[PDB]
Symmetry: D2
Subunit: 431 residues, 4 copies
């Protein structure tokens, strides 16, 4: 049983609480698209763990590689190079767009955004950073200063020079021109304001191609390109945070490939490490050279460690080889259609959006009003878990609660169907 | 050979440089106290990789546990609990001093300091952080704002409210009272200044028990206690960063046990993960409860992941069971004596300091002047590597270069001797 | 002659340049609505000096009072009270709206905004300040941090927590809803953004009722009220900066009386001192009491000095007694009509706006496009001076250049006509 | 009577309190070294009003000049030049040391420090400012951020990059080397710390030659010079704030002349305006030229106003002509000797320091301990006023309360004696 008195006792006496609420179960095993509680009940993992496991849990290949380096080459002085590191850096230079040539191999997504941000400040000689008002880049210093969906209160000033602009949100547009949502004009209008507040020290704009924690908000047609132009125009770098969207999740190896827009620095983590703590940034040779000339420093314990690098290389291999980017589009499409079928069935489903296997479903009280359905979302989530489907809902003011659905890229056609079915049931039950 | 053209070619084309210089070799394997290059030459690892591997490389136990969880329970939604996590948190509550009750399991040392710092700001309702002028707490936002040994220039303002005070340094004292180094008066004098600059928002003082990157500077007799009193007096938390000193490295499980001073929050990482990316903070039940009441948030991808937690539990087990804390004192002592013998032999060795297996050797041009020996240190380091002994030297203005010697707690009596011998040779050669 | 070689020589060798360009003449005298150069040519002062002299130059009454206190009671220890000070404070409590009860008598407009801002931060326990993107509150620290029309570049970070929102500008609207300029929705939309960037420390919003330096932009119908509600809703004070609009300039004693909106703190200066350096802030008894309980400090050399206080009391007297507030409406109206007649004559006159004797005329290349007329404005200004009419034009990006026309409240019907006539001539000449 | 019910009623209902406590009397007139209450009692003004009136109250010459410009040329558009302005700027270029060539004519001491600070940041391209831990530069933004004797709490963060170092204080030294107060080593030691906290953006050090509000602390032999060298070494400007020490108060026209050290920018106000609100900064032609090339902006309402400029020129004239700088030394010396006689009489007088007519007397409980005499100082001050001698005491932690004695440079031999006599009586009464 999940009721192990001692377990929960120790849990209550000795864990720091760091957000949300702990799920009432005891996870004892995980395999493929499932985790299993202490009774052995299999729970369908519709969020790939914490939005990371693109290959599912305990993938045999990963298991092998892990084993292999744990026993042969694990951790090293940060000045010592090895093959897994150079291979990975090389692979990444190779599968990212042209213009992205050099990599730095770290441990977390926030760390990767801090590294990119420090690099941008260094090469521009400037310090103001601009993000989206619904962004999430991490819990550490600079990543947090640029995170606007949460975490800003009660902890003192953010970093000097932090600004945000509204993200382009087609489901709930607030900037109109000639009776239509002119998200490109909204962008211009936002920048002029920024321009006016700036001390003349704009260093970068940082952005998620699809804002996940912020409500699966996908940047619309042409937006990214226009954004890149705003930056170039101001001598600012554009850093694209692809912690969740990278590595195939949205049905392209990297989301920025979809818009055909190449950022100055690209950050990776969640899906790169597929569960393990490996992250990275990739930038141009020119930017890297200038950073280096300026003494760029970002020296950590695990930067360039062989085992994690070895792991991420295996991740890319598998993804490539098993055409998991394409599986994302097919299963993605399979899942979207189901969701839309549900939506056909239940009025509370106000919107189905996202791309590939990063989909969101927005719960509303009224389609005409798009009135958020207060607690209905939480209910559905509770029912899902009872039904054996692990889900996650995010909620910001002005928005219905949004389910973030992101199964492993290794997910089966059956698993999807199972998932869709458990979900309609949870919805039927929640009403 | 280490000369693999392609290797270095790819290395040059695709790695971001992040500090220092890459060692000219290709590391292909590692085992116990050694790593091996591409020719198969065994290099004696006198810094435990990046000051982490207390159990040495590829420890069989770690190898087993790793394997075991990689295949059974790897990574989870951050709201899902499991045994390795609760066990570890519990173990830590148990082996740390009384008053430290709840843990938060993260990935890196900087991340662990950011978590502690955010917690302190939250519970005090304040934001000013004070560290040592020769500190190193990491490369991310807040950890970096509190890092004074390096990284401050070229990257814009640090965090609002960052201050430093001089660390107590008995080898190069600068605060005199009645013909003697009154480091306690220096402390008082520093705080009064701080007090005068403060906006009345002092939240914490953060400190390494022994400043490593800063030159192996050990806080002297009674200092820590007095420091803790300064904080209490100001309603500030005291955060002790034991990334390197924790887990037995200095010959006590935790360095703060040595002074018998319990900090408000304790941070762990390098030695906790013993090579893998696992970090943690531990605080009191009261502080944790208040943080929680105030909405403490620090939600990451890998917080509470089973595999890493599983790994750190095995680390503690081994350390405990093999009495590696005591091995640190014995080997530590064996090594100190050797160093002192060298010092007897070579005038350039100006000081031998540190504790347990975290020792430093300061190179000088003149013992009377304590004039730094310009390049001599770098030379010795170069000779060591030729001689097959991997070493590391740190250098700050006003100080001779310092070797940071920190072999695995699993190091043999022979390995030490080997090390001492290779070192005297390198010194003989460098002169 | 204005060509005094020595004068200009010394001028060139010994004056720091602090913005704009020095006018090529030597002012030797001033009287009523004119100043006179070294040839004795009378220049019609259409900006009341630096937008201050509501009573015109060298007003006999002011001259008397000045004389009187210079010789009897001039300057005092800031802890010594006297009649002119208590009378003035009292007068102000009396002529400002209900709810504004206590005054602090200072020297400059920036100083008065710094005092109001410090007070707001103190009583809210918070520090973030929000202003308009085209504001001007002064050159000192906090006043400057809240000034967005200029001065932000090249001088390092502004104050922590500085934000701006776009001002409501009916002549060049950029926020549309249902085919119309919905400036109230623009306001809401701006605040939500602010809300999202805030660290939860909003202390005040500071605002000019009519943005002068920013282009004579008058807050439209209902805007102020809605603004006040935004603040109340967030527990923020509303500080109204009436440096130029106060004391009758816009045809009400205070502009905020026009909207019937009472701010938490009101600041005064330019027109209060009518040329002399006297400024003030006025707040509620409750706010003042709380500030005092919290140790409010703003102790300066000239706070509470008798002579300046004596001067401002005489200013209010005269204004009251000579019904100069009403003269502002009549002459104001006389002047607006003329301007509009011009506008009837010249296509370049794109807009005539403002209120009372604070009017603006926007120069454009095209009424349909509202294309700014590049240099045309500067030309007209140059011609005016030749014609003996001192004028001033302000120019921000996205806007035609704007003449700021603000003659003394003591201005004659003839002086206005003269002014209108000189202006059409300058325009005819400039084309 | 001073008991005018109505006066105090209005006083209580309508004055904002801004520090300290209001003196219980009603000042109705002032003349020479005295002010007179409502009963007509003459109070001997031992602080020259708020440390400003070097010529005493209502000086006939000032009265004439004031009158003259009030009626002929008062206030102007900030782009219009006139004689009083160019003459004054010229005079100042002329009486300040070589290397100080161009002036900017403002209104307050804080404003003058903000102007100097903005200029320094602009020309260095940097933003960190360093002051003394017991400084007072004003209540506005940057001046306040650099003020450490008071005002820092309850009002949010100071300006980014604010630092302080301890001032050299020979009466209460805390930095010892070889049994002696090595204030030069203290300076070095302070800077190294600063260096370590800096983001590499040191723009200026700002300093009072004698810290007044901070306790009449006179920089000792050679200190200033060494300070200037610290700045030059770091590419920082040195700004000397001579608001109180300038214009003859310390027995040289400017205190920096005494050490023969020329700062990059010199600020003036209190004594320059001698009671009226006039302030100024003076810098080198080179610095000014570079500021201008960089768009230096500091455009205010009263910058370059004729009347105030006219007043300060008359002040300098009188000072020069009446050899008031020398009167300061003679009367200063007369007063110091008296003070020392008192000190001979009363043990509570722990120290008599300062220079010229800017003297301080530190009250202690014990000369051996230098134990502050708690409330004794306040008592003496209360007795002085009863005795008809207006005085002022300042008190910081770690220090006895200090009387700041600074009579008009126009003070008579008799007035001094009167003052000394009233003071010994107050002391006799207070015990
Ligand atoms: C005391 C301490 N705390 C925190 C960190 C941050 O660790 P991480 O960068 O992995 O987040 C370090 C890093 N150290 C260097 C990397 P070195 O080993 O050279 O002293 C540290 O020494
Ligand atoms: C886009 C993005 N970048 C960076 C990070 C920081 O990752 P980390 O905290 O591991 O350093 C996250 C974290 N996400 C949440 C944890 P969620 O998965 O709930 O959206 C992210 O979503
Ligand atoms: C050295 C110095 N610089 C600048 C200022 C700011 O002057 P202001 O506030 O008029 O702008 C002061 C004020 N002083 C007090 C008011 P005190 O006279 O009590 O020492 C000062 O002492
Ligand atoms: C609305 C407002 N508030 C405060 C100030 C600051 O006044 P000061 O600089 O005298 O302290 C100004 C200055 N204005 C310019 C000088 P302009 O007259 O050109 O609009 C102002 O317009
Ligand atoms: K490493
Ligand atoms: K997790
Ligand atoms: K005063
Ligand atoms: K002026
Ligand atoms: Na690429
Ligand atoms: Na414990
Ligand atoms: Na009122
Ligand atoms: Na000079």
């Amino acid at each position: 049983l999940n009721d192990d008195a001692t377990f929960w006792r120790n849990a209550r006496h000795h864990l720091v609480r760091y957000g949300g609420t702990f799920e009432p179960m005891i996870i004892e095993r995980a395999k493929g698209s499932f985790v299993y509680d202490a009774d052995g009940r299999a729970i369908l993992d519709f969020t790939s763990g914490q939005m990371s496991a693109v290959l599912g849990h305990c993938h045999p290949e990963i298991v092998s590689v892990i084993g292999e380096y744990a026993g042969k080459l694990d951790h090293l002085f940060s000045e010592m190079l090895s093959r897994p590191v150079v291979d990975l850096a090389t692979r990444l230079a190779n599968i990212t767009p042209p213009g992205l040539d050099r990599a730095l191999l770290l441990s977390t997504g926030a760390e990767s955004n801090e590294a990119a941000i420090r690099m941008a400040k260094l090469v521009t000689g400037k310090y103001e950073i601009v993000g989206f008002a619904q962004s999430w880049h991490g819990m550490t210093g600079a990543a947090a200063s640029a995170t606007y969906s949460a975490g800003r209160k009660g902890v003192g000033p953010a970093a000097v020079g932090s600004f945000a602009i509204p993200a382009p949100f087609t489901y709930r547009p607030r900037f109109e021109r000639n009776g239509a949502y002119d998200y490109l004009a909204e962008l211009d209008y936002a920048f002029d304001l920024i321009d006016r507040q700036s001390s003349g020290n704009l260093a970068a704009f940082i952005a998620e191609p699809i804002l996940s924690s912020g409500g699966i908000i996908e940047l619309p047609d042409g937006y990214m390109a226009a954004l890149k132009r705003k930056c170039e125009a101001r001598g600012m770098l554009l850093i694209l945070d692809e912690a969740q969207t990278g590595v195939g999740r949205t049905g392209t190896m990297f989301a920025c490939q979809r818009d055909g827009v190449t950022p100055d620095i690209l950050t990776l983590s969640k899906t790169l490490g597929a569960g393990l703590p490996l992250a990275a940034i990739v930038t141009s040779a020119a930017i890297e050279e200038r950073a280096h000339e300026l003494g760029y420093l970002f020296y950590t314990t695990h930067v360039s460690d062989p085992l994690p690098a070895a792991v991420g290389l295996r991740v890319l291999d598998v993804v490539q080889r098993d055409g998991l980017v394409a599986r994302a589009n097919v299963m993605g499409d399979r899942l979207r259609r189901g969701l839309l079928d549900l939506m056909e069935r239940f009025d509370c489903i106000g919107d189905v959006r996202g791309r590939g296997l990063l989909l969101g479903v927005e719960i509303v009280k009224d389609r005409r009003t798009k009135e958020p359905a207060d607690g209905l979302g939480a209910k559905i989530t509770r029912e899902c878990m009872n039904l054996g489907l692990s889900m996650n809902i995010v909620q910001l003011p002005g928005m219905g609660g949004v389910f973030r659905i992101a199964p492993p890229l290794t997910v089966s056609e059956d698993e999807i169907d199972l998932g869709l079915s458990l979900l309609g049931q949870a919805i039927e039950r929640a009403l």
